[PDB]
Amino acid sequence: QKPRVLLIGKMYDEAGQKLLEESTNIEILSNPTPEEINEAIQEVSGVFVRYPNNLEASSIRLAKHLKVISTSGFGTDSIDIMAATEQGVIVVNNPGMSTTAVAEHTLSMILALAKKLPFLDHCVKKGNYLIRNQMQPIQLENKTLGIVGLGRIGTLVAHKCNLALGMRVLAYDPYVPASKAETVGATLLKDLDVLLAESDFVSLHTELTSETREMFNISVFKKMKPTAFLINTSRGKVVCEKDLGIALNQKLISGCALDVFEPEPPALDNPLYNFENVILSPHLAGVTPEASLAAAVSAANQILQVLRGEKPPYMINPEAWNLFHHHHH
Amino acid sequence: KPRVLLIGKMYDEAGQKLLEESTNIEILSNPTPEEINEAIQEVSGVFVRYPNNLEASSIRLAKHLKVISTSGFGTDSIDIMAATEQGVIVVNNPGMSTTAVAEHTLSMILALAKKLPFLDHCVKKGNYLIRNQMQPIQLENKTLGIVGLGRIGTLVAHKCNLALGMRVLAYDPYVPASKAETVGATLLKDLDVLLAESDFVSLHTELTSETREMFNISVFKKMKPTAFLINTSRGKVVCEKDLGIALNQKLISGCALDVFEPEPPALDNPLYNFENVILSPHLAGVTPEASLAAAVSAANQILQVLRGEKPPYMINPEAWNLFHHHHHH
Ligand SMILES: NC(=O)c1ccc[n+]([C@@H]2O[C@H](COP(=O)([O-])OP(=O)(O)OC[C@H]3O[C@@H](n4cnc5c(N)ncnc54)[C@H](O)[C@@H]3O)[C@@H](O)[C@H]2O)c1
Ligand SMILES: NC(=O)c1ccc[n+]([C@@H]2O[C@H](COP(=O)([O-])OP(=O)(O)OC[C@H]3O[C@@H](n4cnc5c(N)ncnc54)[C@H](O)[C@@H]3O)[C@@H](O)[C@H]2O)c1
Prior knowledge:
binds nicotinamide-adenine-dinucleotide; Rossmann fold; D-isomer_2_OHA_DH_cat_dom (chain B); alpha/beta; homodimer
C-alpha cells in the first residue's frame, strides 16, 4: 500500500503537496495540538513540519514506521533531532531557498527604521502631517551595519547594503574565513564587542545553537549605541525578548525590527507592541512566491528520496543513516 | 555692513552662521507680503525658504538688492523677470539631497513590496496569522519604471538594477538614451510601453506644464492592476482624485507618496482608507547631511555675489551685465 505522509501545517506552496500525492497519501493538520499529531502520526512514513509547529520526542516515538522528517526551511529548532536519530529517522532541512527574499526584507526593515516609515505613515493618516517639522530622517550612506552570522543571508545582506546604500559593513562570525567578508566589501571582526560599539544597525543572521541562544541580552544591549537599531530575521531565541523590552524602555538602543519571536507565535499582550521605533512582521522574510515554491519542491522531493532508500542532499543527522538502513533494508 | 533678509529660516544653522560672519541678518517666519515689504528695503541679499513667495512688487522696493537665493532647486515662487530688470542675481541650490531622496525611494519601493506597515499593524493587534493570507513580493527580476531620469532617477535606477536585480526602464524625453545605458536602464520613447511593463513606477520628473497632472486616470488604466506607484517628486504631477479612483477600482495595487496636491493633505483625504497606501510628510530630501549642504551652499552663493564673484548656480546669467553696471564699474 502507498506510504502515508503527515503535513503538520501546509507547505507554503502546494506544488510540494502535489508532488507528494504522486506516490503517497497525505493528511494535512492545521496548528494541531500534540494529541492530534499523536493520532495522525502512528502509521506515516514521512512527516513535514511547518515552522513554528513543534514535533516533540514523544510524538516521534509513537511513529513506528517513520523514515524521514522534513522541516519547512533551514531551522530545525522545532524538531527533536536526538529522538529521530535514536529511532533511525532521517531529518532533512531545506536551506538557502529564501536567501534573496530575506536579504530584501532585511534591507526593507533597515530602511524603514532609518526613515521612521510606519510611524510617519500613521502620523499623516491621522492628520498630523506637521510632525514633519520635528522629524530628522537618517541618511544611511556611510553609516555602519553590523552582521552577526555571515552565512548565506548575512553575506547577501552585507553585499546589498554596500551596493544599495554605501554602508560600511562589519561582521561577526567565528566559523567563516575573513576572505568571505572582503569579497562583498565587509570586514570580519574577531571581537563581537567591537562590532557592537561601532554599529548603527545590528542585523542577526546566525543559526540558532547553544552559543547563539539568548546571545542578545541586556548585557549586550548595554554595549550597543543608544542611537542604534537591532534587526532580527534569524530566530527568536537568539534575543532575550524581555531584555529587549527593558533595553528600549531604558533607551539602551533606539529601536528594533523583528520578523522572528520567542515564544513564536507571540502572545496577544506582548509589551513590545507599545514601543516607539518597533517594526514587526510575522515570520514572512523568507516567504515570497519564488522562495515558497523552491522550498516546497525541495522538501517534497527529499521526502520521496528517503521513502525510496536514496540518500538526500540535506541530511542534518547523517550519523543516523546506518540505523535507517537497519530498519529499511 | 550689508543686510540679508531670510524669508524663512535655513535648513541648517551652519548657513546662518556663515552669513552672520560678514553680514547682518534678519529672519522672518512665513511672512505676509507686507511683512517682507517693510523688511527688504535696505538689504543686499535675500534668502527664500521653499515654498515662500518673493513677488515682483517686493523686489521693486529693495533698492540695493544684489542676490536672491532659494533653499533648493525651485525658483518658481521668485519673480525672475523683475530681478533681471533690476540687475538682481537669482541663484538656486540644486542636487543637495539627491542621495537622501534616492534612499527614501528605495525604502518606499521595498516597504510596498513587503507590506511592511500593514504587517506591523497586524502583529501589534495579535493578528500574526495574517501570514497565512498573503505573501510579500520578491523584487528580484521585477521591472522598475523610472519616469524622469535626472539626479535622483539615475541613482534609483542604478541601485535597483545593481543591488536589487530589477530590470529598469525609463521615460524622459529630455535626456539621451546613453544616460540610461550607463546605469543599466533602457530609455523608451513611448510611456505607454513603460506603463504596461512595470511592476513599480517611480516618479522623478521636474514639475513643468507637461508633467502637471501627467499621472491621471488614463495613465492608471494602462498600468498593471498589480503595480505600485511611488511619488517623491512633486505632488501636482499626480491628480489625487484619479489616484483615489484608481485604487478603488483596483486599477493598481497601491502607492507610496511623499508629496501631495494640495499640500498639506486634508484631514478627510480618501487616500487614508486604503491598505496598500504608504505616506510620508514630504521628508524624502530631509537628512542632516542634505540640510547642511544646502544651507552652506546657499550662504556661500550669497557671499560670492556681495563680493562680485559669479556664483555657480545663476538662474538668470543674462542679468550679470546690468548687475555690473549697478554695483561695480
Ligand atoms: N523568514 C525568515 O525570517 C527565515 C528565512 C530563512 C532563514 N531563517 C533564518 O535565518 C537564519 C540564517 O539563515 P542562513 O541560511 O543564512 O544560515 P547559514 O547556515 O548559511 O549561516 C549561519 C551563520 O551563523 C553563523 N554562526 C553560527 N554560530 C555563530 C556564532 N556563535 N556567532 C556568530 N555567528 C555564528 C554560521 O557560521 C553561519 O555562517 C537561520 O536561523 C535561519 O533559520 C530566517
Ligand atoms: N520629496 C522631496 O523631499 C524633494 C527633494 C528634492 C527633489 N524633489 C523633487 O524630485 C524630483 C526629482 O529631483 P531631481 O534632482 O532628480 O531633478 P532633475 O532636474 O535632476 O531631473 C528632472 C528630470 O525630469 C525630467 N523630465 C522633464 N520633463 C519630463 C517629462 N515630460 N517626462 C519625463 N521626464 C521629464 C528631466 O528631463 C529631467 O531629466 C523633482 O521634482 C524635484 O523637485 C523632491
